[PDB]
């Protein structure tokens, strides 16, 4: 492309020149013609758009469904002339009015965690080094048009995609466009063809850290590769989300349920003497039955309170749905470069006398030290102190070393920080051993030199430090240091230092060389004139002290969070754009490679025999890199994916990390994607969950994820699973819990049309039981502990792990639902009988009960009573059927603790949030039934003693047979009771 | 789904087998059921019912019953026979369960004093029920005038109290209906009535009531107020109160206890 050009083939493509750049007049052309240099920000949605579809849904869809029947039912009823219809109005209310508040709670949590999240970004205005037509002035950087001669220095953003003319010692900082975690070199020179791995280019809103370059401006604005990226994750489309997915099958199971029981009970209302329209009625009445009221409304509480416990450990989710993914999630795809390392270089190995020594890495100094009692490792500390031109920040003592702020390049820096940690205050040191000479690093060299004077006034001796690149040193340092003896090297620590440095360098390590010379007194005495112009000082003959190597390591929880996600059967896959020696070194060290695992190289190594000759099923690691998954079709990397366990992808672009993403999501699995870099995004937005760095993320990434990650903590990661598997049990238990109770709501009303017996349930009654009474009961099911190690089971299979299956609905449903429904029926009789009504004259008596011109009905004692006094026995009705209800809730929320435990082995009372609501949901029943005006109010009747005990002993039996059926389950796993009464 | 050899995702076995656990676990649940109402039923006295939590004061109804809209509405023109056919026809059969003949199961009651019964001292293990026959009613029991007073324009209406097992209305003095214009009309004066039996009186014999088991063949008194000074083609709402010691009439939510109050236009 453009750097593969020439400047002979520039200058020309682009209408400019390598010395003046463009005209004024032309440039203001080239910016009419194209935009400004800036990418092109994002349109959005609109809050009343995302209000609307947070009014979306799948139950959401349903309540909507369900209020519509109800206002068409009323529509029938009122042209049929029937009256008391308020109950179709208070069910559509009822309905609209939780969709709703949902909606308005979720899209309010939403709000929350996008201020939480905007609250660390700042924009500062830009600007840039132009030269047009001669004249060097500091223009705007969306001013740029392509073909603009401009200049960058160190510290200067990179204002525009950029080809390189003239460069002295320009790195630039690529970690968050690519993967590359060291310092790039760029210089005037093609080195490669495409324009990621050139040295020739420069890429927009990069750092230039250190130098000075100049170049012409090839692409603006959206042309960049940074645009070209926002572009791609634009395209990306964000799929639903597998706790979605889980609802919309329970609703499609409601709506099957709520079909059939209508359709049975429209053929019997038409089989028993009802008109067609009557039984539609009927038929539509039953379907709106099935549908759960505060169902939605307890299943946002359960996942807020989750996001809450998140938020708690600096896990800020952008929506609701958010906290399950990782629960569900079997693989995880996770970027290097600032994700799992620190991005910064540090200090990691050392190798002096004759042993390779481990430094701690953790940002936060909680790992291993090393030896610091060798003389030779006194005199390395005072060579890496003393030839150390960095300097920290001034005002930054309490700020922890890690963290400073220190002005030079990133290998200086590590080496000014390692010396802050080891030998403690870096400068004082310094400023004790006054320089009198200095040679900068330069090209031609690759070493830099400083002559200092020794601190102690007796020693009139200079003291000769050296550092640079291992074989410059050897090629000079006649001599070496061990264990304080000045040995030269008889080629035994010349083999053994070859040794070390290709160990080193293996490691995906940078390796610096360090020496001492101490000058004599006679021939060098004090106020001796070094001169640089003559090199009169000795360049040769130097006692070689050790190698230090710099990496940029891991985060401090990062191999634990590693090897507990391994733990909970999920796969991790490292995918980065940096170096693939880089990248297996690091995949090992965090414990995406176990140890003893092997590549196909490793094991052609191992046995000294070409590649191909190695079985690939041999070898559990894998590093597989760009250009090799160039050439591969979607079989080969499946084929790769399923042979490999152990799979490192490196140099990888990130439309192939959205390739391999999708390849994972294609084979079945539920896929977590966590980066930092613009480079991520469009993977993160592909992901089932995206997980972004807080800190270290970029805007790009951060925006595409679902998850923030405030402060960078990857063990999140693993709080983040593990209360995603408790959230979905939680929720299982909860929803067992909601379904119970509509079983006994619905068979009064089905008895009422067939049998006519005077109606038991009244609609106000089963709205007070669904939105009032259970939901705090409901709610505080979220609270309950893991019946088992949750985070040592594999990840459940998405398309058999169920949230809501069958075992469950059907339990739910027809048997814990059935012996309330029986409870209700017995205390109904009872009420009915005490006060003059026998079940057979209850059998048929609908029509002349609710008749208002028959004042003068007869009961079973012959007595007569009028429309009124049967309305209020019919509240009593009312009330013993609520109260039965509730009574066998407080055994179902009891028994819903567990699912495979005891309540004597899970704890009746650990849970004081569900013995509150206990507490609660009594006295709101109290309240109801004995606080005056209730009757005509809710028409709730102040029941007498008696009629709370009826329906204890049901109660008592749904808690016995609970817990039998569970004992039955732990004591005999895997007979026919466990696979089929086992939920 | 519905694979042949697996029928929704279960095998046939399998699905004989979960069905007769659901048909065992119904069977249990309803015998439970069945012994619970037995348990009921076998504490429940067949005399007297356990509470009278509804039934702290008896409704009044009237007759003849025509609902309008809002409640009791009777219209009618004198000079149309056919307006006030229907209205004679339902004084007459409701008057026909009052004659001799269906009050042969009854005694005679002269004590104007509560009859109470502690002992089954009649036939078939009952209680006594006092008689009350339709003469008693005089002018207003359909003889000499089958008519009730319909066609001369002064209507007879019939009013009778709800039954309570062991309801005492009070016996300082008989239980009295009353009968009056709800809204006084302006020009004209109040309510003109004549009552049968005389100052429109239930006897205290006939209370208390023992319910159907102990008193099959019991009746409800009848009151017959005749009213004499309805104007025509006007339309008057009149209120009929039971005044009684324990008769309260005072329920915004029941207006039918312890009062009856209907609307009546008399066409010309
Ligand atoms: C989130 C959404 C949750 C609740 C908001 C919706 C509340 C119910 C929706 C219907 C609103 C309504 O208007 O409902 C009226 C009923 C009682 O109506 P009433 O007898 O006073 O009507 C008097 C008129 N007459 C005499 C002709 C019958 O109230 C009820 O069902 C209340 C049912 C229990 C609601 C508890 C909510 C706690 C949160
Ligand atoms: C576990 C927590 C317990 C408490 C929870 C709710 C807190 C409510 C606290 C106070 C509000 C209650 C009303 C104000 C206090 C005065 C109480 C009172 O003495 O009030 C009487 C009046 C008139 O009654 P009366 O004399 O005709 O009744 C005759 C009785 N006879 C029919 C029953 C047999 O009642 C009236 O004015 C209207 C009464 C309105 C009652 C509440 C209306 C809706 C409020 C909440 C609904 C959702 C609850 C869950
Ligand atoms: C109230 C409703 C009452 C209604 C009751 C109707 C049900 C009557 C009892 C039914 C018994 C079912 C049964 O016996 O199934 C036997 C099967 C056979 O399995 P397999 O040989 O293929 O296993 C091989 C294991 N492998 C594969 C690992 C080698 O499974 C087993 O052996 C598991 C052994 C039994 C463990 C569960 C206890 C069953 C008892 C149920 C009665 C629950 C209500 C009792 C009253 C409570 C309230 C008072
Ligand atoms: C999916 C499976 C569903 C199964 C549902 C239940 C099926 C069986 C339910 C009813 C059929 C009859 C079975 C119960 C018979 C009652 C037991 C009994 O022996 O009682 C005796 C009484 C007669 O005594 P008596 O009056 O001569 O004594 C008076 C004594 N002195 C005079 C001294 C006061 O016989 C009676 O009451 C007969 C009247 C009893 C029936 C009342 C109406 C029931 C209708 C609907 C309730 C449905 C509830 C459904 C709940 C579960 C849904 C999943
Ligand atoms: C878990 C912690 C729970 C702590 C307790 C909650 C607070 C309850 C305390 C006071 C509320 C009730 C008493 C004040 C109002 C009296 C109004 C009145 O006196 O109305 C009378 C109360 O009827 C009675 O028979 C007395 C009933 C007393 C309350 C029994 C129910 C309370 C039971 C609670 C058990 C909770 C624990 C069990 C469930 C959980 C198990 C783990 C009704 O009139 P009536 O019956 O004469 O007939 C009516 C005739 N008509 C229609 C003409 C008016
Ligand atoms: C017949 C009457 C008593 C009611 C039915 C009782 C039911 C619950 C009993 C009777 C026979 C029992 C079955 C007998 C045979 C089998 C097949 C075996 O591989 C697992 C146990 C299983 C599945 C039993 C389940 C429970 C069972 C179905
Ligand atoms: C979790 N679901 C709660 C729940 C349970 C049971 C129900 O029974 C129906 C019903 C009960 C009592 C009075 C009236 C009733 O229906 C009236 C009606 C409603 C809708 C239509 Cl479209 C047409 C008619 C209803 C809701
Ligand atoms: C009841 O009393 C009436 C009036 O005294 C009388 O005519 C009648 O014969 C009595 N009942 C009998 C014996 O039928
Ligand atoms: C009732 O009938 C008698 C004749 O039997 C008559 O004398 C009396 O006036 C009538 N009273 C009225 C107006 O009902
Ligand atoms: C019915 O009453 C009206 C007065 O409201 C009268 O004009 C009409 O003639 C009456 N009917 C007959 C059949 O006379
Ligand atoms: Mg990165």
């Given at each position: 492309n453009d750097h593969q050009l020439s400047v002979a083939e520039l200058e020309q493509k682009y209408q400019t020149?390598?010395?003046?750049?463009?005209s004024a007049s032309l440039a203001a052309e080239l910016l009419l013609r194209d935009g400004p240099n800036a990418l092109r920000p994002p349109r959005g949605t609109p809050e009343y758009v995302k209000f609307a579809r947070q009014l979306a849904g799948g139950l959401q869809c349903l309540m909507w469904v369900a209020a519509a029947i109800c206002l068409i039912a009323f529509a029938i009823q009122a042209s049929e002339g029937?009256?008391?219809?308020d109950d179709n109005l208070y069910l559509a209310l009822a309905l609209i009015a939780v969709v709703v508040v949902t909606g308005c709670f979720g899209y309010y949590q939403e709000f929350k965690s996008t201020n939480i999240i905007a609250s660390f970004k700042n924009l500062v205005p830009q600007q840039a080094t132009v030269i047009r037509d001669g004249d060097k002035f500091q223009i705007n950087a969306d001013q740029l048009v392509v073909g603009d001669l401009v200049e960058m220095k160190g510290?200067?953003?990179?204002?525009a995609d950029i080809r390189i003319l003239q460069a002295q010692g320009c790195k630039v900082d690529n970690?968050?466009?690519?993967?590359?975690s060291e310092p790039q070199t760029r210089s005037?020179?093609?080195?490669?063809?495409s324009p990621l791995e050139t040295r020739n280019i420069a890429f927009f809103?990069?750092?230039?850290?250190?130098g000075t370059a100049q170049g012409l401006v090839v692409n603006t604005g959206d042309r960049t590769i940074i645009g070209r990226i926002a572009s791609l994750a634009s395209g990306v489309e964000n799929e639903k989300t597998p706790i979605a997915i889980e609802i919309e099958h329970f609703v499609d199971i409601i709506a099957g349920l709520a079909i059939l029981f209508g359709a049975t009970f429209f053929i019997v209302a038409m089989c028993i003497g009802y008109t067609f329209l009557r039984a539609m009625v009927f038929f539509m009445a039953i379907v709106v039955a099935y549908v759960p009221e505060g169902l939605l409304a307890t299943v946002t509480v359960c996942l807020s309170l989750t996001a809450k416990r998140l938020a708690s450990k600096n896990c800020v989710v952008?929506?609701?749905?958010?906290?399950?993914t990782l629960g569900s999630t079997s693989v995880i795809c996770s970027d290097k470069?600032?994700?799992?390392?620190?991005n910064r270089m540090t200090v990691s190995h050392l190798w002096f006398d004759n042993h390779i020594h481990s430094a701690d890495t953790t940002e936060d100094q909680s790992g291993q030290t090393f030896d610091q009692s060798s003389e030779t490792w006194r005199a390395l500390c005072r060579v890496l102190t003393l030839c150390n031109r960095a300097a920290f920040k001034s005002?930054?003592?309490?700020?922890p070393v890690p963290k400073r702020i220190v002005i030079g390049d990133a290998s200086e820096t590590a080496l000014l920080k390692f010396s802050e940690l080891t030998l403690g205050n870096a400068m004082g040191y310094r400023e004790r051993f006054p320089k009198v000479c200095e040679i900068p690093f330069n090209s031609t060299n690759k070493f830099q030199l400083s002559i200092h004077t020794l601190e102690d006034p007796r020693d009139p001796r200079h003291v000769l430090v050296m550092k640079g690149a291992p074989e410059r040193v050897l090629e000079r340092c006649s001599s070496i240091l061990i264990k304080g003896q000045e040995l030269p090297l008889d080629e035994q620590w010349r083999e053994a230092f070859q040794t070390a440095y290709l160990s080193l360098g293996g490691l995906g390590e940078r390796v610096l060389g360090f020496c001492q010379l101490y000058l004599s007194?006679?021939?060098?005495?004090?106020?001796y004139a070094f001169d640089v112009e003559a090199?009169?000082?000795?360049?040769?003959?130097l006692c070689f002290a050790g190698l230090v190597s710099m990496i940029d390591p891991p985060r401090a929880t990062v191999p634990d969070a590693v090897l507990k996600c391994r733990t909970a059967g999920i796969r991790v896959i490292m995918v980065t754009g940096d170096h693939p020696i880089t990248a297996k070194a690091i995949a090992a060290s965090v414990g995406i490679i176990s140890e003893g695992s092997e590549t196909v190289e490793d094991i052609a190594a191992r046995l000294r025999?070409?590649?191909?000759?190695?079985?690939?099923?041999?070898?559990?690691a894998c590093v597989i890199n760009g250009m090799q998954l160039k050439d591969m079709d979607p079989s080969e990397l499946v084929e790769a994916l399923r042979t490999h366990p152990e799979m490192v992808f490196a140099r990888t672009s990130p439309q192939q990390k959205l390739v391999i993403v999708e390849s994972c999501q294609r084979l079945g699995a539920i896929v977590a994607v966590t980066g930092d870099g613009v480079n991520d995004s469009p993977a993160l937005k592909k992901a089932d969950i995206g997980v972004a760095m807080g800190?270290?993320?970029?805007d790009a990434a951060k925006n595409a994820?679902?998850?923030?990650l405030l402060d960078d903590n990857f063990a999140s990661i693993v709080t983040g699973v593990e209360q995603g598997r408790l959230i979905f049990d939680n929720l299982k238990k909860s929803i067992a819990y909601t379904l119970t109770k509509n079983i006994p709501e619905l068979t009064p009303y089905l008895i009422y049309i067939?049998?006519?017996?005077?109606?038991?349930?009244?609609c106000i009654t089963i709205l007070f039981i669904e939105l009032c009474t259970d939901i705090f009961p409901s709610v505080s099911l979220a609270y309950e502990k893991a019946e088992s190690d949750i985070m040592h089971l594999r990840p459940r299979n998405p398309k058999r792990d169920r949230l809501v299956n069958e075992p469950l609905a059907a339990y739910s449903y027809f048997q814990i639902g059935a012996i309330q429904s029986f409870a209700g029926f017995t205390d109904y009789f009872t009420a009915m009988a005490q006060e003059g009504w026998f079940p057979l004259l209850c059998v048929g008596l609908r029509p002349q009960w609710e008749n208002?011109?028959?004042?003068?009905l007869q009961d079973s004692y012959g007595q007569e009573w009028t429309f009124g006094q049967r309305l209020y026995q019919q509240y009593t009705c009312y009330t013993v059927f609520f109260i039965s209800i509730e009574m066998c809730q407080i055994a179902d929320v009891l028994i819903r603790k567990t699912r495979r435990l005891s309540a004597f082995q899970q704890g009746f009372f650990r849970n004081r949030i569900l013995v509150i609501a206990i507490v609660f949901q009594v006295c709101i029943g109290c309240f109801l039934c004995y606080c005056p005006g209730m009757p005509n109010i809710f028409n709730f009747m102040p029941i007498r003693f008696q009629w709370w005990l009826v329906p204890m002993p049901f109660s008592l039996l749904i808690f016995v047979y609970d817990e039998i059926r569970k004992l039955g389950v732990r004591c005999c796993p895997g007979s026919w009771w466990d696979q089929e009464l086992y939920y | 789904n519905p694979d042949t050899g697996q029928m929704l995702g279960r095998t046939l076995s399998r699905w004989v087998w979960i069905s007769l656990y659901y048909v065992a676990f119904y069977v249990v649940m309803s015998g439970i059921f069945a012994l619970c109402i037995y348990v009921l039923m076998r504490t429940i006295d067949p005399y007297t019912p356990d509470y009278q939590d509804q039934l702290k004061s008896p409704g009044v109804t009237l007759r003849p019953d025509v609902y309008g809209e809002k409640g009791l509405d009777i219209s009618y023109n004198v000079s149309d026979s056919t307006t006030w056919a229907g209205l004679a026809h339902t004084l007459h059969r409701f008057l026909a369960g009052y004659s001799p003949a269906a009050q042969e199961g009854s005694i005679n009651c002269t004590s104007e004093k509560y009859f109470f019964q502690?002992?089954?001292?009649?036939?078939?293990?009952t209680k006594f029920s006092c008689k009350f026959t339709?003469?008693?009613?005089?002018?207003?029991?359909?003889?000499?005038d089958p008519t009730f007073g319909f066609a001369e324009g002064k209507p007879c209406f019939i009013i009778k109290m709800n039954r309570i097992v062991?309801?005492?209305?009070?016996?300082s003095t008989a239980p009295r209906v009353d009968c009056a214009f709800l809204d006084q009309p302006r020009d004209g004066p109040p309510l003109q009535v004549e009552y049968f039996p005389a100052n429109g009186t239930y006897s205290?014999?006939?209370?208390?009531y023992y319910g159907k088991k102990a008193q099959p063949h019991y009746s409800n008194p009848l009151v017959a107020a005749k009213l004499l000074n309805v104007p025509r083609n006007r339309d008057v709402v009149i209120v009929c109160k039971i005044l009684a010691?324990?008769?309260?009439?005072?329920n915004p939510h029941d207006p039918y206890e312890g009062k009856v109050e209907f609307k009546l236009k008399i066409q010309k």
């Amino acid at each position: 492309n453009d750097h593969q050009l020439s400047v002979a083939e520039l200058e020309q493509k682009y209408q400019t020149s390598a010395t003046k750049g463009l005209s004024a007049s032309l440039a203001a052309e080239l910016l009419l013609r194209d935009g400004p240099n800036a990418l092109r920000p994002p349109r959005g949605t609109p809050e009343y758009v995302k209000f609307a579809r947070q009014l979306a849904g799948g139950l959401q869809c349903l309540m909507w469904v369900a209020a519509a029947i109800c206002l068409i039912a009323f529509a029938i009823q009122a042209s049929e002339g029937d009256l008391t219809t308020d109950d179709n109005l208070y069910l559509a209310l009822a309905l609209i009015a939780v969709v709703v508040v949902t909606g308005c709670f979720g899209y309010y949590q939403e709000f929350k965690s996008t201020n939480i999240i905007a609250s660390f970004k700042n924009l500062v205005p830009q600007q840039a080094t132009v030269i047009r037509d001669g004249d060097k002035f500091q223009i705007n950087a969306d001013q740029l048009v392509v073909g603009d001669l401009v200049e960058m220095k160190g510290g200067d953003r990179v204002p525009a995609d950029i080809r390189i003319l003239q460069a002295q010692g320009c790195k630039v900082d690529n970690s968050s466009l690519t993967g590359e975690s060291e310092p790039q070199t760029r210089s005037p020179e093609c080195t490669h063809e495409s324009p990621l791995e050139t040295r020739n280019i420069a890429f927009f809103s990069t750092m230039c850290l250190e130098g000075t370059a100049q170049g012409l401006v090839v692409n603006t604005g959206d042309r960049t590769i940074i645009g070209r990226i926002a572009s791609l994750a634009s395209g990306v489309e964000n799929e639903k989300t597998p706790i979605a997915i889980e609802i919309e099958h329970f609703v499609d199971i409601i709506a099957g349920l709520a079909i059939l029981f209508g359709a049975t009970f429209f053929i019997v209302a038409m089989c028993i003497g009802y008109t067609f329209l009557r039984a539609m009625v009927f038929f539509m009445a039953i379907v709106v039955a099935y549908v759960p009221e505060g169902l939605l409304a307890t299943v946002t509480v359960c996942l807020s309170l989750t996001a809450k416990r998140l938020a708690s450990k600096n896990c800020v989710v952008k929506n609701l749905e958010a906290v399950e993914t990782l629960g569900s999630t079997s693989v995880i795809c996770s970027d290097k470069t600032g994700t799992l390392t620190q991005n910064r270089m540090t200090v990691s190995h050392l190798w002096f006398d004759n042993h390779i020594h481990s430094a701690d890495t953790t940002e936060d100094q909680s790992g291993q030290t090393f030896d610091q009692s060798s003389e030779t490792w006194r005199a390395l500390c005072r060579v890496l102190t003393l030839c150390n031109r960095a300097a920290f920040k001034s005002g930054q003592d309490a700020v922890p070393v890690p963290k400073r702020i220190v002005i030079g390049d990133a290998s200086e820096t590590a080496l000014l920080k390692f010396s802050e940690l080891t030998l403690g205050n870096a400068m004082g040191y310094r400023e004790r051993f006054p320089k009198v000479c200095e040679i900068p690093f330069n090209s031609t060299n690759k070493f830099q030199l400083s002559i200092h004077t020794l601190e102690d006034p007796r020693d009139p001796r200079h003291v000769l430090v050296m550092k640079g690149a291992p074989e410059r040193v050897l090629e000079r340092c006649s001599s070496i240091l061990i264990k304080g003896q000045e040995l030269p090297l008889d080629e035994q620590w010349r083999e053994a230092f070859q040794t070390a440095y290709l160990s080193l360098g293996g490691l995906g390590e940078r390796v610096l060389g360090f020496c001492q010379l101490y000058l004599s007194e006679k021939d060098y005495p004090p106020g001796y004139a070094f001169d640089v112009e003559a090199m009169n000082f000795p360049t040769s003959g130097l006692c070689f002290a050790g190698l230090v190597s710099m990496i940029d390591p891991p985060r401090a929880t990062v191999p634990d969070a590693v090897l507990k996600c391994r733990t909970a059967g999920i796969r991790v896959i490292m995918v980065t754009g940096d170096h693939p020696i880089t990248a297996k070194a690091i995949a090992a060290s965090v414990g995406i490679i176990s140890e003893g695992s092997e590549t196909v190289e490793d094991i052609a190594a191992r046995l000294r025999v070409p590649v191909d000759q190695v079985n690939r099923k041999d070898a559990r690691a894998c590093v597989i890199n760009g250009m090799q998954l160039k050439d591969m079709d979607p079989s080969e990397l499946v084929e790769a994916l399923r042979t490999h366990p152990e799979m490192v992808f490196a140099r990888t672009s990130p439309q192939q990390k959205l390739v391999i993403v999708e390849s994972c999501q294609r084979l079945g699995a539920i896929v977590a994607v966590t980066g930092d870099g613009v480079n991520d995004s469009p993977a993160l937005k592909k992901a089932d969950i995206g997980v972004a760095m807080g800190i270290a993320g970029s805007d790009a990434a951060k925006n595409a994820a679902d998850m923030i990650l405030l402060d960078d903590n990857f063990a999140s990661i693993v709080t983040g699973v593990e209360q995603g598997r408790l959230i979905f049990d939680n929720l299982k238990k909860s929803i067992a819990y909601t379904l119970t109770k509509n079983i006994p709501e619905l068979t009064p009303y089905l008895i009422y049309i067939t049998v006519s017996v005077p109606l038991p349930l009244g609609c106000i009654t089963i709205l007070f039981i669904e939105l009032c009474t259970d939901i705090f009961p409901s709610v505080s099911l979220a609270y309950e502990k893991a019946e088992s190690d949750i985070m040592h089971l594999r990840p459940r299979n998405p398309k058999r792990d169920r949230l809501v299956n069958e075992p469950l609905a059907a339990y739910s449903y027809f048997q814990i639902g059935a012996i309330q429904s029986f409870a209700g029926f017995t205390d109904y009789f009872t009420a009915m009988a005490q006060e003059g009504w026998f079940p057979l004259l209850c059998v048929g008596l609908r029509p002349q009960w609710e008749n208002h011109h028959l004042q003068d009905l007869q009961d079973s004692y012959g007595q007569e009573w009028t429309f009124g006094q049967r309305l209020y026995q019919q509240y009593t009705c009312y009330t013993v059927f609520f109260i039965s209800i509730e009574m066998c809730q407080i055994a179902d929320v009891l028994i819903r603790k567990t699912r495979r435990l005891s309540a004597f082995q899970q704890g009746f009372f650990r849970n004081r949030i569900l013995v509150i609501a206990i507490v609660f949901q009594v006295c709101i029943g109290c309240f109801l039934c004995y606080c005056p005006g209730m009757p005509n109010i809710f028409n709730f009747m102040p029941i007498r003693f008696q009629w709370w005990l009826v329906p204890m002993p049901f109660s008592l039996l749904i808690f016995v047979y609970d817990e039998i059926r569970k004992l039955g389950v732990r004591c005999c796993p895997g007979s026919w009771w466990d696979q089929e009464l086992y939920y | 789904n519905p694979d042949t050899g697996q029928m929704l995702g279960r095998t046939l076995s399998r699905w004989v087998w979960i069905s007769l656990y659901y048909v065992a676990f119904y069977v249990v649940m309803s015998g439970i059921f069945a012994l619970c109402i037995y348990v009921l039923m076998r504490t429940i006295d067949p005399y007297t019912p356990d509470y009278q939590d509804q039934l702290k004061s008896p409704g009044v109804t009237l007759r003849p019953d025509v609902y309008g809209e809002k409640g009791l509405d009777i219209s009618y023109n004198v000079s149309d026979s056919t307006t006030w056919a229907g209205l004679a026809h339902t004084l007459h059969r409701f008057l026909a369960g009052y004659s001799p003949a269906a009050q042969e199961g009854s005694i005679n009651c002269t004590s104007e004093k509560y009859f109470f019964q502690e002992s089954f001292l009649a036939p078939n293990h009952t209680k006594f029920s006092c008689k009350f026959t339709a003469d008693m009613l005089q002018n207003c029991s359909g003889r000499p005038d089958p008519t009730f007073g319909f066609a001369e324009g002064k209507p007879c209406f019939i009013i009778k109290m709800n039954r309570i097992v062991k309801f005492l209305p009070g016996n300082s003095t008989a239980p009295r209906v009353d009968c009056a214009f709800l809204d006084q009309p302006r020009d004209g004066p109040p309510l003109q009535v004549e009552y049968f039996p005389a100052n429109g009186t239930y006897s205290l014999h006939y209370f208390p009531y023992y319910g159907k088991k102990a008193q099959p063949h019991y009746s409800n008194p009848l009151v017959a107020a005749k009213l004499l000074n309805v104007p025509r083609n006007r339309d008057v709402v009149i209120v009929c109160k039971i005044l009684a010691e324990h008769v309260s009439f005072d329920n915004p939510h029941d207006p039918y206890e312890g009062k009856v109050e209907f609307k009546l236009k008399i066409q010309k």
